[PDB]
Each structure stands twice: as structure tokens, then as C-alpha cells.
Design a protein around this nucleic acid. Sequence first.
DNA 1: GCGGTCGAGTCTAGAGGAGCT
DNA 2: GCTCCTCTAGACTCGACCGC
Lengths: 362, 347, 918
Amino acid sequence: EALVDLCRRRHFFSGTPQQLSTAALLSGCHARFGPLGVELRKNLASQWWSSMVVFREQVFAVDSLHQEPGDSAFRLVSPESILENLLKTSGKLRATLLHGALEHYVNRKLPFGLAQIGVCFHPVTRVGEKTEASLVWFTPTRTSSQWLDFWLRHRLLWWRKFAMSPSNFSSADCQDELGRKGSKLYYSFPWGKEPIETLWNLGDQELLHTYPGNVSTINVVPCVLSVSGDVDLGTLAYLYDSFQLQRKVLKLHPCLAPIKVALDVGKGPTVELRQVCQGLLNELLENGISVWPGYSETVHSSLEQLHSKYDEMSVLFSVLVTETTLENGLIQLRSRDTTMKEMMHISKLRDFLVKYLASASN
Amino acid sequence: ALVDLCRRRHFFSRFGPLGVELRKNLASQWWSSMVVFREQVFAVDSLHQEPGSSQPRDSAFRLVSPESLENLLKTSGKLRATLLHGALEHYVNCLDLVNRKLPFGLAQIGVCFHPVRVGEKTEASLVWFTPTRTSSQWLDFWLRHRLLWWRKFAMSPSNFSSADCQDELGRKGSKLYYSFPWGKEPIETLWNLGDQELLHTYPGNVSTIDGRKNVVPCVLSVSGDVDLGTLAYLYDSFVLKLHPCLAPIKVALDVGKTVELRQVCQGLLNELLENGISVWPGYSETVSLEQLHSKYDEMSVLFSVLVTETTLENGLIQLRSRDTTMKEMMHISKLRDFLVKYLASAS
Amino acid sequence: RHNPLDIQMLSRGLHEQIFGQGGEMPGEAAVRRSVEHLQKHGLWGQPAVPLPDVELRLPPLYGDNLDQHFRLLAQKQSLPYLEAANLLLQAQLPPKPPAWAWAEGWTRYGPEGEAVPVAIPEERALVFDVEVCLAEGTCPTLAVAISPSAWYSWCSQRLVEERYSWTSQLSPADLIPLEVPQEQLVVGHNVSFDRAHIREQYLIQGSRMRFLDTMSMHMAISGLSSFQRSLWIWLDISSVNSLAEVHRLYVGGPPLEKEPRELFVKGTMKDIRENFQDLMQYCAQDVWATHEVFQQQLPLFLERCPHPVTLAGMLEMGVSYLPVNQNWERYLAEAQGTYEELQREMKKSLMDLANDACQLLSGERYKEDPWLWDLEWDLQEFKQKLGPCSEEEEFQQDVMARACLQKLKGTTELLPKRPQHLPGHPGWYRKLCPRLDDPAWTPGPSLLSLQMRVTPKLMALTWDGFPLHYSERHGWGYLVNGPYNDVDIPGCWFFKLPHKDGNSCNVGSPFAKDFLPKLQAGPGGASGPRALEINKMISFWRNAHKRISSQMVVWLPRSALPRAVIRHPDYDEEGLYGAILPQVVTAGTITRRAVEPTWLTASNARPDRVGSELKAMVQAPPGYTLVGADVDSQELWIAAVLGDAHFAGMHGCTAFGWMTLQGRKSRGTDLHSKTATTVGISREHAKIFNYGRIYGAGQPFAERLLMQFNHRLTQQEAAEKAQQMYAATKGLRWKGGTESEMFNKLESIATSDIPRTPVLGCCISRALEPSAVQEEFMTSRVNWVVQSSAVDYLHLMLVAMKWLFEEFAIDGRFCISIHDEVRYLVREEDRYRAALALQITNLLTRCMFAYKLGLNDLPQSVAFFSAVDIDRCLRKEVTMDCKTPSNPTGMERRYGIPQGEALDIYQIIELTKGSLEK
DNA sequence: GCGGTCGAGTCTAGAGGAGCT
DNA sequence: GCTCCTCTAGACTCGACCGC
Ligand SMILES: Nc1ccn([C@H]2C[C@H](O)[C@@H](COP(=O)(O)OP(=O)(O)OP(=O)(O)O)O2)c(=O)n1
Ligand SMILES: [Ca+2]
Ligand SMILES: [Ca+2]
Ligand SMILES: [Ca+2]
């Protein structure tokens, strides 16, 4: 079975089969990510945000509107007023977050960064939207090449960190219209390599057409590196990479998997076991471990199908609370990677999960 | 006044960096309390633009490609005004997820575009697909639960209020309120729309549009303004005593009484960040202790940590609390556990 | 412009000013025999297109012939240094002073033992020995030296002052200053260690001080081959390279005391600061032994190496100099980072293989896996010993659930004191996965590694499509060195993995260095083959990262860089420039071939080898060009002209000489391609086999090598192949082979009473003469003849190039001679004058080699360098971009090194108008 | 009192040389 | 063709300690 069929069945992907085409996926004109896909994309954005603004000094946060003031960008025309006046004063949707970052330039050291995650609109004319995570890194002119090289390898290491096969995340070199230098990350999708992330060593030009007035506002007038990764395309890259391209399992990184614990109840008595499982679920959630309540599911299925379903959904750990749990506290914990069943005591379960999820992230 | 304090401390720009962090915390609390803790409530992702209707009565701005006027109101997409219509298109999408077991919920925190120019507000919408007979019961349940949620993080839960009103079609609904200093502004609103709303988005077969029987749910919409909600929590908390589960910055490290202290602070900061505690690295600042106290109070920092020469001699770090403004001494290895325990107990 | 064999000899413009006017013409019988020999192999009657003729005004050759010209050149070169060697040979030395001075610089003690403040020895001859504490750093600690009528000592500031603020950055201000601010000779045992710790030798401009090594002269006089070294641990006339054994062999008497208190290999700063007065005494006695053995060796060396070219080349072969820049630290940092990253990737692939291997437990599927069937899969058991709800009801249900959970969490009274360790996992897994209670626990098989007896089963390694199997009795083999019957695997034949020590040993790691050329991951899964690719990528840096990372780089500041760098616009104030002075012994073998493990290697940059661009990291400073010219088939041509001189008086009279001269690689008519076509092997292996055959390696060596390169070749088939491959070239004794006269001359000049190199006349080692060793080590002597002739070729090249550089004032310097390559660090303006100088040096060297053999002629083919690579970083071709797993973007993209131009003699003449004047 | 478990001890194969440290 | 030195890491064996 192809990956996209799996990610559509297990709600990583949403949309009609006419929207599951490669061009439709890579264009962004339809809501492609199902619930689990949105949760995985949120995990990816969280990893990006922590590793780039929290674990990283001199990088900050930026808020930008979905409308650039005053190109192929779509225009916002008020139907109350409804051609010459529609292209001079009408607002325009943003195509990249770079111009939003340059608006928050100071609002006084160097180097620094202005990282942001948001939605950008792409002509496809239809309208396509992609979630872009942009780091706009300012450097003195001399160090720009060195900082570009450092950002290229750091971003490549970050993208390969969660990757089962780090070799697929390739890199290259490119030049833009004005001859500026820049690199371009890739992922070797089965059809071909796509630029999940690009870096452009934008010169002094960018601060000129966003601050065309006094130059004291923009003491070296810094360049711009414009690191911009596509987290929708990145999420699809990690959905293709986790699949082996046996047992169908999305070997997603424990820091990216949407569902980490999958509780369940063995047999009768139903009321006591379900009360215990609810208490355990409340215990897990307080620390911050994302659980999938499988005990409340009225659709009953064999253990094999349940385990296969949890494998496909990239569930790290599967917990079973049987009637014997009421006596001593032994719950038959199972792990996705090995598929081997433990008999861990209740008091150790939460601590073991926290320790595992702290070792995986470090 | 409060506006000056929010402006200087990066809460007001609208939302400064601390304001955006507080809004992110508020959205995360909403998400947890309405999706994670709450059963059968899921996430919905939908595009910002709408397919585009033929009715000129809509005030939503249209999307026109510059590469191409009476046809601009026919086949040109428009920006969404409310998240309600986006949720209704995922009804089938999340129907199989719950195995078509009513009731089930859809939640989403996105951007809504309303004509002010074009204005953008961050609306956190809960759309509940309840059967018709239990419509008012679930409506009152959600009303009281949302009122409790909004009062929980507030120092003064009396300012938050609720009231009723009626829709254009005579449909009954409840509106939550916050008593702003200039007067009540509804930060949330609940309507009992009924099966009519689901009828429009699914004009086709009825079977795809509650015990063993299946009925078209009496779709009621719970929509809250987390931008106006963040404004309400900034007004109410006024020194800003924001909630520990909402405050943007938990810990403010520093130094006092050099390179060894720098490394100690670096290790402490790295441990705190690895655990998951947001920290303000005040040791990296360019340069009084009372001024730092005032600054961390205005920024709503729960605890100010001071690392001094004694931290090398004894391993004890001075800890100051925003709530009590008193000094405490603790060993470095037990600061992380103390902070985690305090955050867990605050929730 | 032609010879009796239609081979286009040198043009009359050059020949009339190189060889003799009258000369001598080969007789009718000689020419007839040569033509018969050429026509017997079919090489006679295959004319080739003529190269365009060259008209140059060569520098006026001194003396009468080439031989006198060289002799005068080498005498003028090595005159002031042989004088210093003689001064040191006969001298009177005061006794070692009882005490030493705890100064900061140089110290000298004479008859009075006065505390003389010295900064420079100010002497032309100083035996030397530098002492460096290995643990603290490569910076010197102290050194004791002797000049005639003096005793010297210098101790670093790292000892006189006890502060620990010492950086890993190395600058010449931390080293031993010897040279004065003219000619000098500095002597020692393994001087390449001393020179690397000298300050004035880390400078881009050349130095007028030359270094002579007692180990090198010993290896020339009475050295031992590696087999003879093994047999030694002729016995009374030779010794091993160690100072004590050499002193016992030459001087004898009271043995040198090897200190068991090794306060320099496993000691600290304090261990030396305390036993200073005893470590200096040991160093002083080492210096005394070196001086005594130098006295016993120098007359022997000058007797056994009479030609001044030998000593001059040795004095210039040992001043190698490799410049570097700040990209060396980037090379090391990126190579180590990529090594660690690929090690993590390989470990994660191994853990993933293990995780995918557990699932064989389900249903006991492991019993059919060809690799994991014999592991321990045992299991252990645990032990022990409709509507909403009101707020009040919701609170009550929450409290009840939490209370039930807390009640359940109190039953720990039955669990055992010591928790079990993963009883649900199979037996072989619990070993891999760490203890759940460890303070450094990580999930999964976090202890898995390549060296374990599991990894070549999780990778499912297949040797020629055969799974790898381990037996305690025999070692790592495979299942289908013979079918051992100790192993009783049902239906399989346990063939051991071939080992470099034969079939009497055991193999414990199929990831050893010997197995790199061969061995692939088997069934599905893209993590096994990826792990093997990671292993092959890292192998080089794994086995040689200690040496490369520990190379004693010294970064010069702007206070010592030449003006031809600061003014050059490519120079940046934020880059550190320096050099690496390779620690190479000038005569490290019986051959006198220089030996060094890292720099002097045949390995070059590859797209499948981490850190393999190390030579490409020798980047000339801004303004300098690494003008160099790999000698086009050096040793093959040397052996060819030897055979030509033996057979007749003209080039090409032997089939080997024709193939070397008239054969071309484009048509596959040269020696290597002809051998490959006749046998059916690749050119890379044919090159190794041919160069080994030129060294006198016997037929059994060829049989074993053919078995090794192609394991499908049996013993009998390899024997037949090697016999046919040697009969066509060596011949039957020889006569009837293309190299009959070549090998006959080699054997005749190796079996003489005192074997000599036919060009310079240097003598073979006393341990290999027919009197001392009788008729033993024929292969060693035959190899020595050709390889020492090649060393004589290098000596002639160095003498000629130094003469050309000094006469015409070329701002150059010898850089390195990696095997046959010869690189020069010439300034950018002189890159064409230096190219012409290298062409003239090649011409004169070939003419000298032919003249000392009596050929008295030279073909136009070999008269000049094919291409003098003008470049800025060492590399085989100027078009290479040096893409490696540690350098994915290439050389030009990453390090900003533009490609250079591989010129030619005609282009050089057109650029320089044929004249080397300025 | 006794079967399981754990920390050396011994052995062997490989890897830097057969020189300087 | 044939050995030597030390340093490191993986595996079988051994007795000594301990909870049932
Ligand atoms: N089996 C071998 C092969 C090579 N060498 C060394 C000694 C020679 O000095 C040098 C010769 O290498 P070349 O670069 O001259 O090889 P070719 O030029 O013949 O290779 P090709 O003509 O294929 O480029 O290599 C050696 O000692 N033993
Ligand atoms: Ca020495
Ligand atoms: Ca010594
Ligand atoms: Ca060559």
C-alpha cells in the first residue's frame, strides 16, 4: 500500500482522492492534513520553535498580518465598492513572511534573528496556502557567507535529527535573478527532490525597499539570510521518510509522533477497570503526555488490529489495564519500536514514560 | 495607566512579544481544557479563503488575481469571516473518526477576517454537534463550563459575566461578557443554530448530513475572541499578577555580588529549558536589584532567581516570589523540581 | 631527430648542447640485434606521429659532459655542509656537566660550567635531541645539544613557569630558535622530530640550514629491511633503528640506559619539574651516543655514497614544507563532526536493525533467519513476591477515579527488592539494552556496536552472497580458508574469512582494515547497506584520525608572513596562515626512500571517504602557486633505460623501452593497459602488480596477489596466470622476455661484491651485501636497485632545481615529494619561469640518467613534462573539486580555491619566449 | 539452605609502531 | 616469508552476595 493511502486512512491526510494527487499535495490549495496530520505538524512547529528561539539565543518572535499593505499576490477588493483602483490602493495577501519580519526590524545588537511560523498564500488562478517557518537572520556584510554556511548545516542537522534516513535531506547551491548566492535544502521524495527549505544571502537591497527613507533606521546596515522552511512540505517529508518506502508502521520520532500513549481495558469488570483507566489517563495528561483514549471506544476489535492501528498512527507506547491490575498493579505496556510487552507496575508507568520522552528529546 | 505599562513592557505594540506569548499561553490553555481534558473534541484545519457565494449581500473581501467587475462577485473566493463554516465541512471528515457516534465536537484556533479596511481577529471556535433534544442542556453546560474556564485564570471572577439574547431567526443563544473599564464587551458567544446550518453545506443526500437513531445535529457554536480575551486578562490582572498558567515568562535568572557565575547560570538555564520552563535570561543583559525586581514584576515573572558567589560556596540560589515579594534560599539541584511542583499546583 | 629504431630522439637545438658532438654511433651488429628484438615482439614497424620540435637556449652546462656538470652542481651545493659534518666528525668533547641551568632559553656549559646566557648556539654543527611531554602538549619541554667544545641546553617557558594557561594554538614563539638572524648543519637522531620543534623552520621563504639524520645515514650504511628487522630482534654488522641498538652496533661498550621512569610518554609537568636533573642526564647521554655513532657513520656513508648528488639530495629532500591556512581547522572540525554524525547515524541504523530483529521472536521466526538463529532468545517471567453531567457529579467521579488510582498505587508491597531487567525482551536483547536503573540509561539497544558478535548478524552481512558465521574455535567465517568440520551447521560449509596472516589464525572482526576492499549487507532494509556505507566512508578517518588531528601545525601571525601575501588582495586579516613541516626521515628504508605515514601516501581525495581531502588542504598562501609535475612513469622509465643500456646503446632497443616510450594510454598500447588486456584485470590492480614485478617480487607473490584481488582465482589458476605473466616479461633463464635485459642488469648489479646504483654509485646496506648475507634476500636487492635509482633520480631533480632557482633567481622553495611527485612553492609571477625550470630539470635529469648508462641520447617523448600543474592546492589533477562526504559542496564552492592550469612545454615556451630570464 | 545475580579474572583478536617522543 | 612491544575491547568463567 502506498503511503498516501495510509495517511488518508489514519487521518494524517484529509481530502478527496482528486486532492490526493502529488501536485495537489505540493501546491497547498486544499486542506490536506487530517487531525493526526495537524498534530504532527504542530509537533514539528514546536520542535522548530524550541530549537530556534528557546534553545537558541539572539532569535526572537514576530507577529505579522496576513495582508501586505498596498507582484502576483492576490488582492482584497471590497464588494461594497463593486479595475484601475483595484491595483493601487487595494490590500494584498502575503506570499512570504520575509516582509513581515522586516517590519519588526527593531521596534540594537547584531547578529540576531526574527523567527516566525505562519500561513503564506501561493498562486496555483486558484489560491494555495502553505505554512512557512521563516528565520530572517541579520549579519554584518563580511560574515554573511560564514553565517549562511552555519545556518545551512545547522538546518540540515535539525532536519536530519528526526529523520530515519538522514541521507535523503540533501542540499545544493543556487543563484537568484540578481546573482545573489544561496543554498537550497531538499528531500528525496519518491517522485523527486523538492525544496523543503531555501536560504538566500539577500544583500543590502532588502532593507532598501522596506525602509526607502532614512538609512539611520536600518552600525553596519545588515544583510539578510532569509532562512525559510516549509512545514507543510516538511510534515509530508517526515510522513514519507518514516514509512519504509513487514508491518506498516510510521517510525516517527518520539518528539514528533502525535499519539504517545494508547490506553485500553482488557475485560470485565467494565466499571472498575474503566475508572482505573480514567484515573491513569488523568494522571498522564497533567504531566503533558498526549494520550489516545482507546478504552472509551465502543468499536471492539482484536488486539492484533488494535496494535496495527496504533503502529500506523505512530503510537509510541500501548498500555493495557486488565482485571489483574486491580490486584497488584501490573499493566502490559508495549513499545512500537520493539513490539515487546512489559509488565510494568502502575507506580512506575508515568515516571518511565517521562524518562523515555526526556531521553528521546536529548 | 495600564496601556503605558503594556506598551513599555512589550505587551502592547497590538500585541507585543510578551503579549503574543501570553496569547499563545491562553490559546494553549483553551486547547488543553477544551480538547485534551475534554473527551470527544478534535482539531480542525481549514483554509482561510472560502469557495465564494453568488450573494452580494456578504461583506467579506474577495480574492482577485491581478493577472486577470460584475464577475468578481460570482467566482471569486472570499476571506472567511467566522470559523463556523470551516468546521461544518469537516463533519464527514471527523464523522468516521468517532465512528459516527453523536455527540462529537470540532475545535480550532485560527484567524478570522472581519471588515473594520480588513481586520483580523484570532477566534477560538468550539462547534458542538449535539442532538436536538439535548440542545439547551448542552448549551447551558457549555455556558457554565466556559464561564468557569474564563473565571479560572482571572483574579476577579466577578467581572466576567453572562447573559442571553436571541438570533435573527428567533434562535436562542447565550453571550459571555467581560466588564471592561469602558463597559461590557462580549468575549465569547454561544448560539443554538440548529440543523439549518448543516443543511446548507450539505445540500445532497441526507444520510451524510444519539443512541441507535441518527439525527442531523442541532449544531450550536461556541466562539471566543482570544484577542479580546487576552485584552480582558491584561486588564483584569492589573504590577501585573497574571495567572501562572498564562504568564509568558516563569523564571528570570541573573547574577550578583564572574565567568564561573556565567557558567552556573548557563547550566541552570539549559536545565530549565530542557524541562519545559520558559526562562528570561537576565544574565545576558548589558548591565539595580530593585529595578530588576520592578521590571520582572511588570512583566509578570513568577520567580526571580539570583545566582551569586555563594552559589559556588554553598550551592544556594536566592529565589524571590512575585506573589509574596519575599526572599527564599534553595539548592540549585532542587530549583527545577520546585518550579515544576509550583506550576503543577497552580493549575 | 631520429634513431636507428625510428624513435624521434631529441631535437638538434638541445642535443648539440647536451650530449657529445662526436659521441658514438651504435654498430651494425648492435642495431641489427636491437631491430630483431623489437620485431620479435611486433613492436618494430609501428611509427608514431612526431611531437613538435623544441628550440631552447639551455643554461650553459658546466664541465665537459653531464656527469661533470652535476658533480660540480652537487659539490657547490653540499660543500659548506660536508665541511660541518667533518668538523663534527673529529672533535674533542668536555664531559657532561653534573648540573644544568633552570633558565628560560638556551644555555651553554664549557670547561668552567658557567651559567652562560645563550639565545642562539652560533655553531655550524650541533647534535640535537628534543624532549616533549606527550600528555601536556606537543610544545617542547627541554632539549640538550652539543657542538664541538660545547654542551647546550634549552628549556621551554612551560617548565620555568608553572601556570597552566597554555592554548592548543601553536606559534613559532613556543619553539627552539637555532638559526642566526651562513650555512649550518644540525644533526640528531630522527631529526625530523627536532626540526618540527624548531622555530625558524616554520617560514614560507626557504632556509639555508640543512638537517642530517643519524637514523637516515644508518639506514643507508647498515640498515635492515623490515624482515631483517624482525629477524634481528650480517647480524654483527647491522642493527635496528633505535638509538641504543645503533650505538651498540657502531660504537659499542657501555650500553645506553633505557629509562624505565618514562616521564615523557606517561608523565606530567610535575614529574619532569622534579626529575629535571636526571631527565637531562638521560637526554645528554642520548646525545652523546648519537654523536659517537655519527663519528662512526659519516666516513662509512661518504665511502658508500661517493657521488655528491646523493648527499645534496638528502640535504634537500629533508626540508619539506606544507603550507596551510585557517581551513585546516575547518577541515579537522568538519571531518570530526561528520565522523561523529555518521557514527551516530550508523549506531541508529544498528539499533533499528536490532528493533526490526526482535519481531522474529513473534511466532519464533528467528529459527529460520540465517544470521540470528544461534543467538539467545530466551524470555524471563515477572517475579514480584444522554446528556451533560452536573458539576458535583463530575467532581465526584473525578475524585473517585483518582482515589481508585491512588489505592492501586499502594500495592508495591509485593514487588521484589531488585527489579528485573526487561524480562519480556529476548535474551540477546537484554545484554544490548542498558540497565533500567542506570543513571546513564538510554532507550533501545544503546550498547550495540560494530565490534560485537551481533552486528555482522543484524546487518546480515554476506561475503560473496554468503552469510557471516562465528565459531569459537576458528573465528569469523561464512556459510554457503577451507571447510572446517568443527563447526556443525546443518548443510553449511564454514569457510574462514581470509586473514593477512594466513589460514592458521582467527578473525574476530569482519569490519577490520583487511576487509575494506572486499562483503555486503544482504536482504531487504535500507539501514544495513547504509551502515556499511557509513563504515566505508569513515574507515580512513577512523584508522588515521589520531595522526592527522595531532599533526603539529604552527600558525604564523602577520609578523612573519611574506610581503607577497599581505599585499595580495586574497589575504584576509581574519585568517591564520602557517605550515606543517612533515616529520619524514630522508632515508627511512634500505632503499633510502623517505618514510612518513600520513603525508607520504598514495591516497587522494574521494567522494566516498571522510577526511580524504587532507592533501587538498595544503593550500598555498595568497600569491603562491604549488607548481608541480608528477614524473610521467618514473620508475618504469628508469628500469627501461637500465635494460636499454644493458642491451644496446640506444633507447627503445628493448621491448620494455619501446612500450614505455611509444606506447600510449589512449590506444591502450602502454604497459599497464597491455597487461590488463592480456590478463583481464583492472588498471588499478595491474599497476600494483607491474610495479611489484619491477621490484623483483617473485612469482609466488604474484600468485598470492592474484588470489587476493580476485578470490575467484584458485591456487593453481593463479600460479598458471602468474607464470604466464612473468614468462612474457621476465623470461626464461633470462631470455625471451620484454624485460630480460632489465632484470639481468638488476641481478648483475645486485650480485656484485659491492652492489651500486648504476647512476650515482651508492652502496647497498652492509646487511644485504653478498659477503655478509651470502645469497639471501634477492628480492630485497632487486627492489633496492630500482627504488634507490629512483631516489637518485629525485636527488638529481632536487640538485638541478636548486641550481636553476639560485642561478636565475626564482622565488621558490621545495614543498614536498610525495612518491614521484615534486611540488614547488613558487610565487605567482614565476609560475611560468618555474614551469620552464621544471621542464629543463626533467630534460637534464633524463639526459644524465641516459648518459651515466652510456646511452648518450634522449627521445623527445620523455624529454619534457607532459603537464606542469600550476595550482593552489595539492591534487592529482587541476580539474578536481575535492568532493568528499566531509566536503559535499566541493573545493571551489566551500574553500574558494579556483582551478589551476596544467600547462605543457610548448605553452611554457610561448609564455616565457623560451628564456628563464626576468 | 539454595538457585539467581553480579563484579572481577583471563583470554584473545585487533590495532599504533617496531623511532622520536 | 616471518616475529616482537603495548593498549583496548568483547566474551566465557569463576566465586561471593542475597532474597525466596
Ligand atoms: N605497486 C606499486 C605501485 C606504485 N608504487 C609507487 C612507486 C612509484 O614511485 C609510484 C609510481 O606511481 P605512478 O603515479 O608513476 O603510476 P603511473 O603513472 O604508472 O599510473 P598511471 O600511468 O595509470 O597514471 O608509485 C609502488 O611502490 N608500488
Ligand atoms: Ca631525536
Ligand atoms: Ca632523548
Ligand atoms: Ca608518475
